[PDB]
Each structure stands twice: as structure tokens, then as C-alpha cells.
């Protein structure tokens, strides 16, 4: 991996931004990109989860605050618990990183590449950049919430 | 054999090394125990100073085991350590050359002097943590 500017994460602001040089060989970069995609997706979904949960809840989860302290409610804890089991099923099973052909490539279960998208470098970069922005954000939303008790709306 | 990280004392007496595979397993266990012990020393040091959010009530010392927040923290730490040790983590050790996880963070060199320093510092940390824990459980 002598050059990586052609990888999806290059982006115009800072091409191949890596002052510390943690990943510079193909194997390290593949591992770090798998981790980055996982973190970004988890963040994209955490952020939307906050936003929706504030103004929406499932039956039986009405009492849950829907914010940072959502885990306090026993029903919300049972729900987080069932979500944990489902995420384990996805991780050790369908979306296992080891079985993945490429970092973050889990086979495109729903053919978004066939419809309203493609497995192009442009869309890979879009996913990566959105994951970064969602990451930085969830941290902000959750932390700001802790410092000043407020919900996602901010 | 017996020519890898043996300073100031050469080979330890009554060594259990046996064959090459046995020595490999023993070195893996030794480096793992050292690294844990070094980590535990640092954790006790930092706990004596600062606490996690929502963790101020629990004792800074051993007492965190049977306290409510400390109990959950310890259980989740154990679960995460299991995730890391079963191999699910992407940075996994080479079956040969134990104690080498591929250098997750590109800190730098892997010289014999560095390996000896790591092993010996873990050796100290072993006694440090064991003595600290024994002293706490004994005195109070």
C-alpha cells in the first residue's frame, strides 16, 4: 500500500490525512477501514436513533426518557438487551468482518448497488465521510447532553 | 533454546520450558500476565486519584468488586476482554512468536532490548499488583 489516495477516504479537504501513519500497509489499512466503517455506521444509526426516539417510542417503552438515561428504565434495558443479542447475531453471523470480502463489504444484502446506487468509489467515500461526521456528532450530542441535560434536539 | 529475553540471571532454575511448543505457551502466558499486571498497577494508581462518571460513590480500592456500579463495570470489562481474547478482535496474535499482536498502534521498534524491557517491567508489575492486592485484603 505505497499509495492510498485512490482509496475512498481520500476526500478533497485532506487527501490521505494520516499524520500519525497508523495504517500504511495494505493489511493495517484494511483492518482500520473495517473498524472505521463499523464505527461510522454505528454512529450514523445512534444519531438518528436519538433524534427519532425523542419524539417516538415503541409500545411498552413509553416511560423511557429516550435520551442518555434511557438504559435506566427496566423495559429499555430489556430492549437494549434484545438489541445486543441481535447485533451479536449480525456480527458473529451474517456481517462478520472475517468473512467479509473487503473491509465493510458484507455482500450488499439489499441490492442498493442495483437500485438507487452503485458500489462505486464515490459512494464508498460518501459512506465513509458520513460515518465520520456521525461519529463526531454522536459524541457531541451525548456529551453535550450529559453536561447540560437535554435530548438530541440541539 | 533459552536465548530469548534472559538478562541478568540467564535461565531461571527448574524452568518448566520442556519443548519448544511448551516454552511458546509459557512465554505467551508470561507476557499476558505481565501486560495485565502492568495494566492493573496503572488502574489502581488512577483509581486512587479519579473516578469514572457516575462512579464516585464506589470505593477506589478493591471494594469496587461487590459495589453495584463497580459490579456492572467489572462484568462488562470481563465481557469485553472475552471479545478481545477469543480472537474476535481483528488484531490477533500470531500462533508462533507469542505476545506479538501485530503492533496495533505504530509506536515503533521491536528490538530485543525493547522485548526485554517489556517483559521485565511486567515482571515487576506482577509483584507490585500482587503485593498491593494482598496488603489491601489483609489490612482492610
Amino acid at each position: 500500500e505505497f499509495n492510498g489516495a485512490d482509496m475512498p477516504g481520500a476526500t478533497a479537504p485532506l487527501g490521505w490525512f494520516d499524520p500519525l501513519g497508523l495504517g500504511k500497509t495494505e493489511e493495517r489499512f484494511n483492518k482500520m477501514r473495517a473498524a472505521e466503517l463499523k464505527h461510522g455506521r454505528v454512529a450514523m444509526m445512534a444519531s438518528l436513533g436519538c433524534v427519532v426516539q425523542h419524539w417516538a417510542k415503541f409500545p411498552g417503552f413509553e416511560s423511557a426518557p429516550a435520551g442518555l438515561g434511557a438504559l435506566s428504565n427496566p423495559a429499555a434495558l430489556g430492549g437494549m438487551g434484545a438489541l445486543f443479542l441481535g447485533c451479536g447475531v449480525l456480527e458473529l453471523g451474517f456481517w462478520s468482518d472475517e468473512a467479509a470480502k473487503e473491509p465493510g463489504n458484507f455482500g450488499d444484502p439489499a441490492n442498493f448497488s442495483a437500485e438507487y446506487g452503485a458500489y462505486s468509489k464515490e459512494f464508498r467515500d460518501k459512506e465513509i465521510n458520513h460515518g465520520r461526521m456521525a461519529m463526531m456528532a454522536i459524541i457531541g450530542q451525548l456529551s453535550a447532553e450529559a453536561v447540560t441535560g437535554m435530548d438530541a434536539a440541539q | 533454546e533459552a536465548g530469548v529475553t534472559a538478562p541478568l540471571g540467564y535461565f531461571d532454575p527448574a524452568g518448566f520450558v520442556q519443548d519448544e511448543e511448551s516454552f511458546l505457551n509459557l512465554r505467551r502466558a508470561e507476557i499476558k500476565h505481565g501486560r495485565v499486571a502492568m495494566m492493573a498497577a496503572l488502574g489502581l494508581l488512577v483509581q486512587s486519584l479519579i473516578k469514572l462518571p457516575g462512579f464516585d460513590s464506589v470505593p477506589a480500592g478493591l471494594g469496587a468488586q461487590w459495589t453495584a456500579p463497580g459490579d456492572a463495570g467489572l462484568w462488562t470489562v470481563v465481557v469485553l476482554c472475552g471479545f478481545f481474547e477469543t480472537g474476535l478482535n481483528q488484531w490477533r496474535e500470531d500462533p508462533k512468536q507469542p505476545g506479538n499482536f501485530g503492533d496495533p498502534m505504530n509506536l515503533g521498534n521491536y528490538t530485543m532490548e525493547m522485548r526485554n524491557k517489556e517483559l521485565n517491567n511486567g515482571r515487576i508489575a506482577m509483584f507490585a499488583v500482587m503485593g498491593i492486592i494482598s496488603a489491601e485484603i489483609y489490612t482492610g
Binding site: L92, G93, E98 | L88, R92
Partner: peptide, 25 residues
């Protein structure tokens, strides 16, 4: 798979033909 891994292939995973090994042990 590998020549060693083939010694048990066909007797694992949800379907028998899979080889479930997320840890790569």
C-alpha cells in the same frame, strides 16, 4: 479453506457446508 481445515468441513455452521469461525482460531 485449508487442507487442515478440510478435515472437518461439512460439519459446522448453520448449514453443514459453512465454516463458522469469526475468531479464525
Amino acid at each position: 479453506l485449508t487442507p487442515a481445515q478440510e478435515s472437518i468441513a461439512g460439519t459446522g455452521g448453520p448449514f453443514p457446508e459453512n465454516f463458522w469461525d469469526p475468531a479464525g482460531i
